[PDB]
Amino acid sequence: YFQGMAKHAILVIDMLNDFVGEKAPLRCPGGETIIPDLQKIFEWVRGREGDDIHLVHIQEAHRKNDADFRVRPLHAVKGTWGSDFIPELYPQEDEYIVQKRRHSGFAHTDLDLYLKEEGIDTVVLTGVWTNVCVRSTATDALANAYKVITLSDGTASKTEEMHEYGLNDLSIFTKVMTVDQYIQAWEN
Amino acid sequence: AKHAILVIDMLNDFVGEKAPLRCPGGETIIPDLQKIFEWVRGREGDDIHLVHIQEAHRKNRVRPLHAVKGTWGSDFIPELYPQEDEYIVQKRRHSGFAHTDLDLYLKEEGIDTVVLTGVWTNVCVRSTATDALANAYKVITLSDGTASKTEEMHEYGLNDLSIFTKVMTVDQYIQAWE
Amino acid sequence: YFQGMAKHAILVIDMLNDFVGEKAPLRCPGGETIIPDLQKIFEWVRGREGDDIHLVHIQEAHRKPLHAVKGTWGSDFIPELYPQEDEYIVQKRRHSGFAHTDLDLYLKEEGIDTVVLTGVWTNVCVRSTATDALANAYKVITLSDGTASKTEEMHEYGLNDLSIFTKVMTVDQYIQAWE
Ligand SMILES: [N+]
Ligand SMILES: [N+]
Ligand SMILES: [N+]
Ligand code: NA
Ligand code: NA
């Protein structure tokens, strides 16, 4: 996990205008709570010498569909504000961005390809919701022969109950650790 | 309307008293699945297919946490054994879809809905369900057709599945085909 | 193929500024020759009542050996064949329109059973898309005068390979079959 020529990708899953924040139209209540921890990890990674760690930003970007009775769908639509990353956790110029239309960051995307190209062996999961899109991305990373780390305080769900049971499922096949621990692990 | 019922990991390694990697829930559902098998097998026409999915890892001081290809542990339990017309998929990862020909079979057969049974609810069943949806299938989860290591896992497992899946009992599903 | 329940997608492969035109930096000489036929097809489809046929536009969009980088002018579709508002656009980083993209899903969602191929190069990116479409159990039509390659000889042998696994037709023939 940490030694050797280990190369890691931190995936940030759906920290978007639609979902995150008190005023969010599609608000996931858990998300606001993880922002400072995420900011902290962003700063640390950006600070770091070299690139043994990559930040990858994943956004739900559903296709615009005019053939719908409601004024807006209950998901983030591509090209909109809601789809866009929150200013607090906005991507920086060199950072890869992935758009997805299904739960997993992998599904029908170029994430696996990015990961292969960059020689990445471990994915580390952050974002919302821990029990849905986060877990799905993890399952998929595992299925694609990546190692997986879930950051327990880097993830959140609609409810604290969901988050905890999500962590439980994640613990079965991923390594679960806090943000501080992950950082300390690299300090070695 | 055409359906595929996916039966996931009802295998020697996993189900039964003497299974080495016992999932206790699996024994509980066997009668329900048996019901489903007979009903489908006896049904008129091919509106519903039975697809059997078996974990089959590669061989070879490693913790034996998975069913291995060609071993007894990998094989289906007799109670729920496949009949010759029924498609079988071996998988090396959690999902029935991952690195498999499952999607192609569903496309081939013009199946538009998948119905989920087997074990574990929150793991391999969930993963298969997520992939089906990702591939634009409609998804049904059979609540008394699925099980997990613990009842709590199953229960929260259903909770997640209910988010993007239609959850119903076995009788309701059969009943709904009338 | 044109039978009643059929829904079709026409895939337009790589008709981009970098590739098409006398002065394109990565010119494929063939590409300029098919522009009028494709325009005829675009007009016809856009014209048609109903939703039996979709136009899907596919662009190479490599990330930052000369190739078309995403977000550049060169990567953009030529004006002659520019996408209209409701027409799906797929960006790719490898030869096939399928590979690491959301094309299959789009096709799945819309209930399309057949893909019809256009664009360049016949023997490279077009063929690969065609091969993947078949692999994903779509029927495939190739349009012989709706496709082109760097050289005529390449185009011809590409059509030959394509004839092995696809139904090859002219643009006019394809339009007629829907009438
Ligand atoms: N979508
Ligand atoms: N395996
Ligand atoms: N690329
Ligand atoms: Na999953
Ligand atoms: Na090919």
Side-chain angles (χ1 to χ4, degrees), chain A residues 63 66 78 96 99 101-102 108-114 116-118, chain C residues 63 70 86 88 91 93-94 100-106 108-110:
Chain A
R63 23 191 219 112
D66 294 311
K78 177 199 254 235
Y96 208 60
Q99 288 139 308
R101 301 165 51 206
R102 288 305 176 266
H108 308 119
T109 81
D110 77 324
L111 180 62
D112 185 40
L113 174 60
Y114 173 80
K116 279 157 174 247
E117 286 167 321
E118 296 304 314
Chain C
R63 57 166 189 120
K70 184 203 227 258
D86 245 75
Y88 212 59
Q91 327 184 90
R93 308 175 37 214
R94 287 307 182 272
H100 313 105
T101 79
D102 74 332
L103 184 51
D104 184 29
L105 177 70
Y106 168 87
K108 274 159 157 174
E109 283 174 313
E110 307 283 335

Side-chain angles (χ1 to χ4, degrees), chain B residues 89-105:
Chain B
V89 188
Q90 4 259 298
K91 66 178 169 80
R92 297 179 37 214
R93 278 321 178 262
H94 285 163
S95 176
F97 294 90
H99 315 104
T100 74
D101 80 322
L102 177 57
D103 188 42
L104 178 66
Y105 175 88

Side-chain angles (χ1 to χ4, degrees), chain B residues 1-17 19-37 39-43 45-58 60 62-83 85-165 167-178:
Chain B
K2 204 144 145 110
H3 290 198
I5 285 163
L6 310 173
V7 194
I8 301 143
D9 290 342
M10 294 301 177
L11 315 177
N12 285 328
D13 255 334
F14 306 134
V15 186
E17 190 163 56
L21 295 162
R22 183 165 120 88
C23 165
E27 301 145 5
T28 62
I29 69 188
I30 280 167
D32 309 76
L33 296 189
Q34 260 168 347
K35 201 204 260 163
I36 263 271
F37 276 37
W39 170 68
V40 164
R41 268 147 179 189
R43 204 173 179 265
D46 262 62
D47 302 335
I48 309 164
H49 295 184
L50 253 204
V51 180
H52 303 274
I53 296 161
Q54 61 180 155
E55 153 164 294
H57 281 225
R58 294 222 270 149
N60 201 307
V62 174
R63 279 237 273 154
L65 307 175
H66 299 277
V68 178
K69 167 187 171 130
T71 75
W72 172 88
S74 177
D75 196 27
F76 299 106
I77 72 178
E79 309 78 300
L80 293 174
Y81 215 86
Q83 270 165 36
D85 36 318
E86 317 179 321
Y87 209 59
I88 298 170
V89 188
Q90 4 259 298
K91 66 178 169 80
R92 297 179 37 214
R93 278 321 178 262
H94 285 163
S95 176
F97 294 90
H99 315 104
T100 74
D101 80 322
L102 177 57
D103 188 42
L104 178 66
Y105 175 88
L106 274 7
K107 269 149 154 176
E108 246 164 6
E109 299 300 328
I111 278 146
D112 79 321
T113 298
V114 301
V115 19
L116 263 26
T117 73
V119 141
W120 303 13
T121 305
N122 49 136
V123 182
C124 292
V125 171
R126 150 80 103 118
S127 195
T128 300
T130 295
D131 289 10
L133 214 244
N135 281 290
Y137 296 107
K138 284 134 149 246
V139 197
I140 295 166
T141 294
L142 260 21
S143 51
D144 51 359
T146 47
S148 179
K149 191 185 173 64
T150 77
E151 308 200 293
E152 27 273 315
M153 274 188 172
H154 180 257
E155 195 191 311
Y156 79 63
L158 288 187
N159 238 308
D160 278 1
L161 286 157
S162 94
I163 280 152
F164 57 91
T165 238
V167 177
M168 78 206 354
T169 80
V170 173
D171 291 317
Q172 285 175 292
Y173 176 72
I174 288 150
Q175 151 179 68
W177 273 101
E178 273 83 322

Side-chain angles (χ1 to χ4, degrees), chain C residues 124 127-129 131-132:
Chain C
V124 187
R127 134 89 131 145
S128 287
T129 311
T131 305
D132 296 9

